[PDB]
Design a binder for this molecule. Structure first.
Ligand SMILES: [Ca+2]
Ligand SMILES: [Ca+2]
Ligand SMILES: [Ca+2]
Ligand SMILES: [Ca+2]
Ligand SMILES: [Ca+2]
Ligand SMILES: [Ca+2]
Lengths: 315, 98, 79, 49, 105, 79, 49, 53, 79
């Protein structure tokens, strides 16, 4: 069932963190790229974001995602969610904070999704590359060849013993809930949000309220506000401020853990052998850079090793 | 291959903060003063030009260490054994390792 | 045509037993997500009218946590 | 030597004692944003491979 | 930014034949080797941040028409400093550079 | 927080005073463009009913140069 | 020599007879799909060019 | 005329054949790229598929 | 202003004579596809209501083959 995998992820919520090159001027993005993993053997990468995929407030669904604008969590159907590095990658799966994709090599990682006329893009620099399997340096997995042992990120969202922790969110500063009532500033607290305040208009008047609390000073610029929401936890990123007290550790499983399976490698064309007195001549005609290693079966091996890129003849 | 994990940094709005020596591999801790951070929805707080950001970090092994890793061995000379195939007279081939 | 510790759907492809109605249609026809029993819900959670389990802390907080909204109905919470 | 082969040594794959010197140095966050930057040398296991 | 009646930044004007058409900017795209991100536009001029490559294209969808043009122009990434990076980093050392203005003046 | 020769938007960001309500929302919420007085129109231009200014030469030329069509109205053009 | 200049020789431009050696070798299909994979050295006319 | 060049393609139908890398795991698709021909001098190419255009 | 073996449309461009009424608009107005005769059907093909040539093997096959659906009409196929 879906509830087994989405058990602890229902207790969590998205967040807004710092993203460099979100548009052109490094805004605060609803989806923020953290900790790209790209060390498989088929060019398949795993991207962890700050949004939530495969989750809706009402119920779990694989065609609905959850994100945050302001302080309100919004749910939008996944319509155009794209990952591109230098060409548009074909994403495989998504589960909570994580996206799995199959990307061509390049120097950047980009994600984006629309809801209405918005764009919501984040780009984080990261050098991904294609890692072939075997002794031939191909640039794409072939139609046919020889099976070789390879390790790749599986597309199953099971537990598999790997965990990450989630924490209570830190105070979040909202400036939209401070307004002037008639000539004094007023605090609007939505649904028991317990807004903290800090005024230094003639002096310090720090304190915690839960309802109304019209502050007795003039300007909105000389007072700050916060918000302690404790309903849903968040993953402790490095782009979020920590809490005040001691914070418990959660246990959120990493869905797409690395496994070891099978990979397809290219087979080189057969060389043409010519026999001479104590001499072996190989006419090699390769299409990819190929490795040729020889040795002798005597007391000294005398090993040779060279990468063949052009059609050469070796004696 | 390692993986470095960064916890959430603490932000003291106007004051000072210190950190202890936690037992961790390659643990690092610092204090940066006077940052004035800018989150979403305005600045974080009011106490101008003196603050404190901790931003600790420590390293750990990665989740790919269980799949591919290099094993370090020290050798010492041991046994040599072989498998022989033998026959004699009118008796057919029988094999056993020696 | 595989081991009895493996499962085969109506197409003929063989998958493992751990992929039996786990939520993902592994083979083409998706008959692996058809015939299995529904698990029971926890005692510490609150049961909705449609059966969506929510934690008991989320009951009577002034926010919808269910599709049917039975966790915030006046019949289930005296106001 | 933090960059060649022994920058992360563990006795067992399920062990709990780790030795790792990776020249990890924290850096100052700039321009008033909440992030934690650092710098360190590249892994020796990926260099050895 | 011009619609033949006033100033509106979500509108563009072009010519088909001898009639000055004017539509709304729906999908204006500039790509070099990956689709670039636009910054601003004012009159004849567009400003965009592009990856390196050998071609510069720009097109706009009027109705069902495509209306694309391409020119061969080698554009390179130019790092500032004594390290040759291929994308500007999240954190580092601030150094003086020269870029085109964000504003229209 | 900055120099009085720099404009501080109400979020907290400080921009320069040459960027004073020049058309682009330079801060996040766009409080820069809200409070500055309107500039006078040119004396050699025809003032439209919507505040726009079009060149006199363009008046009664058979082409609507205004948004509301006040430059080609029969009340404003005697044929 | 199947890869230098004479891997495909025809007497005229429209001759029916054709000499061709290219080291073409059949490969086994894999995992139960219907395709015919082969393996041969690249062309000698491209390598001469 | 347009009907002259379609006097033998009318009698043919598309087919479904396997191809590598549909999405992630090499399905059987109505589109199946065979014999990409790129021996041109301007970068132009001709692609033969299994669908009908 | 070109060779007699070439054809010139009304704009001024010159195309070859093989590109006259062959199906595709080559120049802007497609004047080569405007004035050309129409050929007959073959003797082995059945002519539908709209004039399309379909083979007699497809006649009364139970499936729609013509544009108007006249290949499966009870008027032209005695049932
Ligand atoms: Ca399943
Ligand atoms: Ca509730
Ligand atoms: Ca402005
Ligand atoms: Ca006029
Ligand atoms: Ca034509
Ligand atoms: Ca018929």
């Amino acid at each position: 069932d879906l509830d087994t995998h989405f058990t602890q992820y229902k207790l969590a919520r998205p967040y807004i963190a710092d993203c460099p090159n979100c548009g052109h001027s490094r805004c605060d993005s609803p989806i923020a790229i953290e900790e790209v993993r790209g060390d498989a053997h088929a060019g398949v990468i795993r991207i962890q974001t700050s949004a939530m995929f495969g989750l809706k407030t009402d119920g779990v669904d694989l065609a609905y995602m959850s994100f945050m604008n302001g302080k309100t969590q919004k749910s939008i159907k996944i319509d155009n969610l794209h990952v591109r590095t230098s060409a548009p990658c074909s994403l495989v799966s998504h589960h909570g904070y994580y996206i799995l994709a199959q990307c061509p090599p390049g120097d950047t990682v980009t994600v984006g999704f629309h809801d209405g006329p918005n764009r919501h893009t984040c780009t984080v620099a990261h050098k991904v590359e294609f890692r072939p399997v075997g002794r031939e340096k191909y640039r794409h997995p072939p139609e046919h060849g020889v099976e070789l042992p390879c390790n790749r990120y599986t597309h199953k969202r099971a537990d598999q013993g790997h965990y990450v922790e989630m924490h209570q969110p830190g105070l979040v500063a909202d400036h939209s809930l401070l307004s002037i009532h008639s000539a004094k500033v007023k605090i609007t607290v939505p649904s028991g949000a317990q807004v903290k305040y800090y005024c230094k208009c003639p002096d310090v008047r720090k304190g915690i309220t839960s309802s109304d609390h019209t502050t007795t000073c003039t300007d909105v610029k000389q007072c700050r506000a916060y918000l302690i929401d404790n309903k849903k936890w968040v993953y402790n990123s490095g782009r979020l401020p920590r809490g005040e007290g001691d914070t418990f550790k959660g246990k959120l499983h990493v869905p797409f853990v690395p496994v070891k399976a099978k990979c397809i490698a290219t087979l080189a064309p057969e060389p043409l052998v010519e026999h001479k007195h104590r001499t072996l001549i190989l006419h090699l005609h390769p299409d990819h850079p190929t490795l040729l290693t020889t040795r002798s079966l005597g007391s000294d091996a005398n090993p040779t090793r060279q990468w063949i890129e052009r059609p050469t003849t070796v004696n | 291959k390692y993986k470095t994990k960064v916890p959430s940094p603490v932000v003291k709005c106007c004051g000072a903060t210190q950190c202890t020596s936690k037992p961790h591999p390659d643990y690092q801790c610092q204090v940066f003063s006077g940052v004035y951070p800018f989150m979403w929805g305005g600045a974080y707080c009011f106490c101008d030009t003196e603050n404190t950001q901790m931003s600790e970090a420590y390293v750990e092994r990665s989740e790919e260490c269980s799949i591919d890793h290099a094993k370090a061995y020290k050798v010492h000379t041991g046994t040599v054994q072989a498998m022989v195939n033998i026959t004699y007279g009118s008796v057919s081939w029988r094999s056993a390792d020696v | 045509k595989c081991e009895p510790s493996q499962f085969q759907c109506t197409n003929g492809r063989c998958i493992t037993l751990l992929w039996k109605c786990d939520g993902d249609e592994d083979c083409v026809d998706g008959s692996d997500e058809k015939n299995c029993v529904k698990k029971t819900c926890a005692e510490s959670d609150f049961v909705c009218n449609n059966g969506q389990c929510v934690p008991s802390r989320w009951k009577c907080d002034g926010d919808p946590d269910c599709e049917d909204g039975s966790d915030e109905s006046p019949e289930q919470c005296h106001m | 030597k933090a960059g060649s082969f022994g920058d992360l040594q563990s006795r067992t794959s399920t062990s709990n004692d780790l030795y790792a010197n990776t020249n990890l140095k924290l850096q100052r966050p700039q321009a008033g944003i909440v992030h934690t930057p650092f710098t360190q040398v590249p892994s020796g296991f990926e260099r050895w491979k």
